[PDB]
Design a protein around this ligand. Sequence first.
Ligand SMILES: CCCCCCCCCCC(CCCCCCCCCC)(CO[C@H]1O[C@@H](CO)[C@H](O[C@@H]2O[C@@H](CO)[C@H](O)[C@@H](O)[C@@H]2O)[C@@H](O)[C@@H]1O)CO[C@H]1O[C@@H](CO)[C@H](O[C@@H]2O[C@@H](CO)[C@H](O)[C@@H](O)[C@@H]2O)[C@@H](O)[C@H]1O
Lengths: 86, 738, 75, 601, 48, 367, 48
Amino acid sequence: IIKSDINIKADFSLRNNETLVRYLDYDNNQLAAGQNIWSLKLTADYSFSKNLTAIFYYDHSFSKAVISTSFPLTNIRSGFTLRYNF
Amino acid sequence: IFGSNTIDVKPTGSVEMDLGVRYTKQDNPAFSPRNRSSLTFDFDQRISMSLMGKIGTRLEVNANYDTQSTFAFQNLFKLAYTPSEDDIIQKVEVGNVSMPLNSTLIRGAQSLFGVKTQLQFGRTTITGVFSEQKSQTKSVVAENGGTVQNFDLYALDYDNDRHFFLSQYFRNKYDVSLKNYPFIDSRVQITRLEVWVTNKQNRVTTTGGGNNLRNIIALQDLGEAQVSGVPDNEVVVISSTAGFFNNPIDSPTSNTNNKYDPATIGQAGSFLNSNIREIVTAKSGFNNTNVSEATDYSVLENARKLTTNEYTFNPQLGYISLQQRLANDEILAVAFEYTVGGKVYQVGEFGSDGVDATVVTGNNSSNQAIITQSLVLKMLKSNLTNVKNPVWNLMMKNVYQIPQAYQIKQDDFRLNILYTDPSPINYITPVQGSSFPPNPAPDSKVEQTPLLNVFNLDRLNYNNDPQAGGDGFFDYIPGVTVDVQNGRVIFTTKEPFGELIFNKLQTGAGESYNDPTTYNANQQKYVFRNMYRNTQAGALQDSDKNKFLLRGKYKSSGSNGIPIGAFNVPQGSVVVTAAGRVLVEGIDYSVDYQLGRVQILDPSLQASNTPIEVSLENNSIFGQQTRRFMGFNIEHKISDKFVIGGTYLKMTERPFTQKSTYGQESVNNTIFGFNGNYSTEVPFLTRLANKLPNIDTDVPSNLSIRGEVAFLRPDAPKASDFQGEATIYVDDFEGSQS
Amino acid sequence: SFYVSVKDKTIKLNSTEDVMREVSIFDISGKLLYNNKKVENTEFQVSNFQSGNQVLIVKVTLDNGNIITKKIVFN
Amino acid sequence: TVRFGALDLVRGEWRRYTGTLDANDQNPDDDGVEFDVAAVNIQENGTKCPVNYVMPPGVQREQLYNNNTVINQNEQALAVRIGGAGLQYQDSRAVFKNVSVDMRQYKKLKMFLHAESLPNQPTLEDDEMVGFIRFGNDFTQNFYQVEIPLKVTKTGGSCSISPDLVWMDDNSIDLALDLLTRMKIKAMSIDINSSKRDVNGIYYPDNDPDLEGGDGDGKLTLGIKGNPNFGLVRNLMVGVKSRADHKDIKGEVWFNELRLADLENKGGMAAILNVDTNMADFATVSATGRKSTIGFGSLEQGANERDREDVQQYNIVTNLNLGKLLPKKWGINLPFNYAIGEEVITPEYDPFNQDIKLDQLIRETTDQAEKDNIRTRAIDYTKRKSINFIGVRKDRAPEQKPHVYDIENFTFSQSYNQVERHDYEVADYEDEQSNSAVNYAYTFQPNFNYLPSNISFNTNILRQSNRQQFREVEVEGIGLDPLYRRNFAFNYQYGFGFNLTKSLKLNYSATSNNIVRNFLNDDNSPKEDFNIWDDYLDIGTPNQHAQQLVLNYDIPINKIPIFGFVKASYSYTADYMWQRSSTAFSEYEDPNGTVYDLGNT
Amino acid sequence: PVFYSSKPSGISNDDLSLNTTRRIYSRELYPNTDIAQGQIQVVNTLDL
Amino acid sequence: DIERPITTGVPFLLVAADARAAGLGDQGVATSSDVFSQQWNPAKYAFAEDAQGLSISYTPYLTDLANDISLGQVTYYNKINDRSAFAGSFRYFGFGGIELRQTGDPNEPTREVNPNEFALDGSYSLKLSETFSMAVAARYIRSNLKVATEEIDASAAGSFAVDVAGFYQSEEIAYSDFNGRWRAGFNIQNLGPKISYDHDDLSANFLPANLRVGGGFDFIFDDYNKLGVSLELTKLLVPTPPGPGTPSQSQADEANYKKYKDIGWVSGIFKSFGDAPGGFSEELKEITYSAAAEYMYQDAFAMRLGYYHESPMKGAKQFFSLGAGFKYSMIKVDVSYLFSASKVKNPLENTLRFSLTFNFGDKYETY
Amino acid sequence: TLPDVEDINRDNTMSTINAYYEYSIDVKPGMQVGENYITDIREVTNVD
Ligand SMILES: CCCCCCCCCCC(CCCCCCCCCC)(CO[C@H]1O[C@@H](CO)[C@H](O[C@@H]2O[C@@H](CO)[C@H](O)[C@@H](O)[C@@H]2O)[C@@H](O)[C@@H]1O)CO[C@H]1O[C@@H](CO)[C@H](O[C@@H]2O[C@@H](CO)[C@H](O)[C@@H](O)[C@@H]2O)[C@@H](O)[C@H]1O
């Protein structure tokens, strides 16, 4: 009874970073900083009515530790957002 | 009760609701296994509602709700009930209301939330309000555009741990070189300066001027020669100076002045060996015996080099100003190069001409030896504070940071020095039973002399040309007495409240500035030696000397229009006063309400220098007490040209607790008064105007008379009363002992 | 642009480019725990403050008059 | 196993006062006295063994909502412990705080005090240890001294002692600041070398045989040394003192709830009269008169923000369109503005001593010359005058061709401002400013072209004169020598734009700042009797001169039919500036006596 | 807190009753200090 | 001031979560049936005029200081018959996302925490007679305000509770000057096991068990103007902790607290009626009362005034409330404001509540 | 996760100075208030 088009938007990102300090006279390549974070933002839209709109979202990010001062971190945010316009 | 039965309040906007979960897992092994992951429900509302409409052509609704607005005042809700004109009740308002008053002594309030009702009994108008005041009254003073900011700094409140002489040579040259300012009696031109500090950030980055980390050894006595009027123990900390110096007495600071010269490390008779270059063997690097790890030298292993935006230096007077002060155990070490005409002197060791950071021998890690070498620098601040060492005297105590001031200008800056004991007096009087030194030099006058002259800050006229007794104004010299970019005032002597006043009060050669027991009882009262020989906290123990006050003002304009220090000022809350008279919001000035800009439009007032007072309501406030505003206004109308008023207002603050600490008081003030308004038209004045030579006007002449009397009855709320009496706690002792 | 960090019961304020004029730290009850009218820096460290009550609200008044609000957890 | 439920470094806002307080000892860092300052908590010291900590009678814990829950706040007292060898006879130990407190709007200063003996030490007896408040601008020269012998809470039995016995009403300080005012007024008649003064210079009215009534307080011993001011307290000190002669005493003393009471809430009044009139669009007059008394203020103003001065102010602003007095067939705009006003401010408190009301000090002086000096030095008087001729120009009649020599291309502005003041800081202050401006601008309307596109020129005469005579607060006999600041300047800048070619454009501009130094003698001494109008049309020596040239060229290389694709555009800007150096440079005298001209830049 | 909340294998209730191992609550050390509900109610003692 | 306050776990459950009841002095036990009738009296969902409804409510905290600190509520009801109704609600208190930035590096990956407390409950209301209905509600409570550190255990604490409520609504009875209608209700709330914030039975806090009783009367004029007056009485069903002493000095206090904390919640309900040395007059002091008035115009405009009074010895939360309501077609908008008359600062001072409810489905005739 | 280093103040350098103040506390069964820096003693009688 309800007809609507579903809009899918998926955004993936993988970012790598490394800071190295190199000694010229001997093998002392020191890893000073780094980042290995990847994220995925997936959204799905559905219009139940002209005023009512439902969106499903799923954000998943995982950051690897490159040096031990950083801790590996996983952040997942998923759910449904309901929007009603007046 | 309402005009009709229609109800057309139509909502506008949107509502958003977030329903979801939040998962987080941080792999910190120090965390408890019970804290391995966090799985929480996520909820969020993003209401952006708007409500407009009417109920029965008599009730009007104007509401706007947004959960992402500012603090509290952008969520407006206005209910307006306007009945017919024959009823006693003329208008009832609930919600965001205002109480505008056509009065000068008794100001109304624009940012109120409550109930406002208007009554009309034939020809008498009664307006009553009971509300909560969401705004705070703010007043600013402006002269010639920019807002005036007033400052008061006592002598002890100098800019500490930020400004450092590069050597004892510059410190001891400072006073004599500035004797005839703005002329500087010195040819010193600092060309290069490298500043190193203790590295606790420990971040490698290619954009902050590169990655220049070096091992550092900072020597307190590096580059120092003797000083004619200063004993050697006040110049260097070395236990014995025998065979230490190798240049004439008054030689300018340079590496080659003593046996700590990095260029001659361990050659034939140096005081340093090659061990000085290594952190591990730093102590063994000294040939002399009594050397301490934090007095004679200090070591840093990954010292970070400050970039040019983290400090400024005075090329002529040989001192530096750090952006961030070193109020802790940080080590400050410098290498600098300067020219005196054709001669070039260097005191530290630059990365360009210093020993290499790393030297490697061998072919592989099995037999490789790694020699990490340190740069030899001049210590300006030690790891461990010792006020008895000359490195302590390297810290300047004569620089004062004008609060909030960033772009000070001449003609936009005033400074005066007062002695407050207890009233502010701009001259110094001798102690009873004694007199100031007889027949002083004109530059050493103290008796009946303004303190600006006493502390060598007023010898020039407006154009910075010398004038006999000064011009009564602070000498504004961008290179000497002020730091324009940073808004700092620098005295022309290194110890203005110490040695300078001591010298001007000295009566004989038997009195020594370094021997307080020889003071002549005028120096006992006035010389604040402890603010220079001791830390500020230690100088707090000398409670009777912090009486000299640096007082003045500066104008902050920036752009066109008066900056009133508030944004989104409520409409109609701005009051502008020029010389006791209230200006007109359309003729004399204009207001840019969103940006908080007041533009004076009267041509005479702009070129006047008269102080303009601007009052306004500030609704961008937080952490304030609840403010109850209530009162009534009477607007009787005897005739079409004569109006009488009867306003009565009461404001009470609600304290957070029953203990009102000093400064954070609550008021329960009540104000009431009466006003009159007589505005007639006088055709006689127009007729007399038409009698003038070439006047043929017909516009009417009006006469307006306004009188008002107001009475204030202040009080404190009963909530903050102890045993029936209004009470303010100087110290309840709850805030001590953090 | 504005960052607040807490490492060990110490709060570090980092406002790049712009200069902070005043900082007020509130516990989440409306209670003021710390106030400094004389910050005047692009970086400020609240080392003379320690509560341990987890969630805090940092309100910073900039020289322009803009007010920046940040919620932090006092680790 | 040792378990730390807490482990902290504790910093206090109160600092132990090091150094001497009594001149008889002069040896602070000796005699083995253990002086401790700490705090006692209801949250940590409810089971303290000598005496349990309890709130003073009537004191309640503050209550707040944290998260829908009532949280009782901590209640704290400052605790001072005297141990080791114990206090000598006249020795004392104190802590201090740097503050900024105005207590002129309150009548009473109050504090709770408690005294107890140290465990395993000889019992402290009543009225042997004296708690004292010392406050003022310092602790050695300018301070009030409030002393109270302390009754000792009886210990030995149960550690739980009733709050009325922990905080005895007999040990409470209840000081009326009017007594401090009376003490200070009396001490005005005691010279610093009097035998009526202590060895420390403190004047104790209770110790004065020739004074009846003492300090007016039978419970407190009041002292004063050097004209302190409780209108601005910069130094607060509490501590303990000894009166046991042949004994060294030890004990613990608590201080709590130091507060101001009995707000002086008498108000004030103000009156404003406004007269506004206009004379047929030719003249407008606006007059305002304002009178306010001590105690008036705004609704939001607190105890220390409301008016502490009587204010009498009037201001008259008059505007005339003098151009209308001339025939309208040639349009002259001649607006005349005249503003005059003065303000008289009489302070509630005498500016000297800062904490005695002016009328009370005037009454209790007994010297006519001193009465007149006190009355006159307190008056804050300001007089303002403003005469303006801003915007004088001749309007164009509705049909003429513009001409380069037309007087309609000129604009004249004249502003005069004068401020006369005298108050507690300056016996005579006069500020005079005169600004004369003439503006000219003409836009021309339609080998290479040489006719300028437009011409601009304006001249400014700016003269600021400042006279400052700081007053002698002790006597109105001579006063300080007046200080003169003069800023006589002559400014002019001119600029003409060109359209030298259809593509080539030239703009020129030059500005010059001159300073007039006719008011200076042969030496660097200003002339006393120099009027601001003396030589008004005098151009001085150049001080700053700047020139700017702007060139815009489109490079018409497209004319030849081989380089028509090039779209070159050349811009050239040049700036020059000459700056006069200070006379300290241009007439520098080396110590050998030779005078050098260090030149300009 | 794992020793007190989710007892590991090999740990008994006797092991948690010693005055050297037991959980210390704030009300025991600070009976007069009010703590908001849902906040930290235990004293994390440093044990040597 | 507040003397011997009643200490309960999860005190956020007692906060009014809807603008309509807040504008009526935080009372809904005996008002007209509405979409928010779950926190106050689930039994009157069976008296709802609309078949089903969904509402969203926003109660911000510390508005001047910060944003996104609020109590949110979503309620849905659906009465399938003219005698029964199903309802579910979700109250949520949170501070919003908080960034745990440890270092000062802009690009360091930051953990975000959202300390929060929420309660999810579902109720079934059945209309026994034409004027009386009862309801039973089951609630799940989760508290997750703690943030994980090296020492702090941030495990969420949870508990369950049941509510028993009844609602009476008489028929429209005609009087001399009007034709009124009577309402009454009771609601025993938060009946469940103690919540252990630190996951230890030795340290458990009473659930905020609460008894609300109330009565309401509606003045009906001209069949289009309605004035509703309601009174509510509230009493916590948690025993009062001892104060001075009632058996050394601290030994007696410790023993008294030992006895008070070793009480079951079922037993605590009955110990609430008493556990004091005073009589009936001094135990009525623990009774919170609230009065309210509501004027309705065309059932699409409402003006709400209410007074709430706690005992000064317990909480001392007393205030006046103002509220307004607007119904366009199926959207009802409610706002409310609080004027505090108490010594202790009310955290909801200077705060505007917002409620938004959607009504849809069939219409049920009122009896 | 941090390596063990002989540098506790994290300034990259290892201090070898031993200039410090010393304070000591007796740990014995019969300690009372008024000596050994003891300012308060709280007795807990019946702990769960
Ligand atoms: C646990 C709660 C779950 C959430 C419930 C959402 C229900 C959504 C139904 C939409 C609705 C309710 C208004 C809700 C809006 C509030 C949103 C607030 C968001 C806050 C951030 C809007 O209907 C109204 O709104 C207008 C919107 O413009 C409609 O216009 C038009 O609207 C569109 C034609 O419908 C057009 O496409 C659009 O072109 C038009 O404009 C109108 O038709 C009408 O006035 C109508 O409800 C109706 O639809 C059916 C379909 O199944 C529902 O069936 C029920 O489902 C279960 C119950 O879910 C029950 O068990 C079940 O027995 C039953 O079969 C019923 O509900 C029914 O009555």
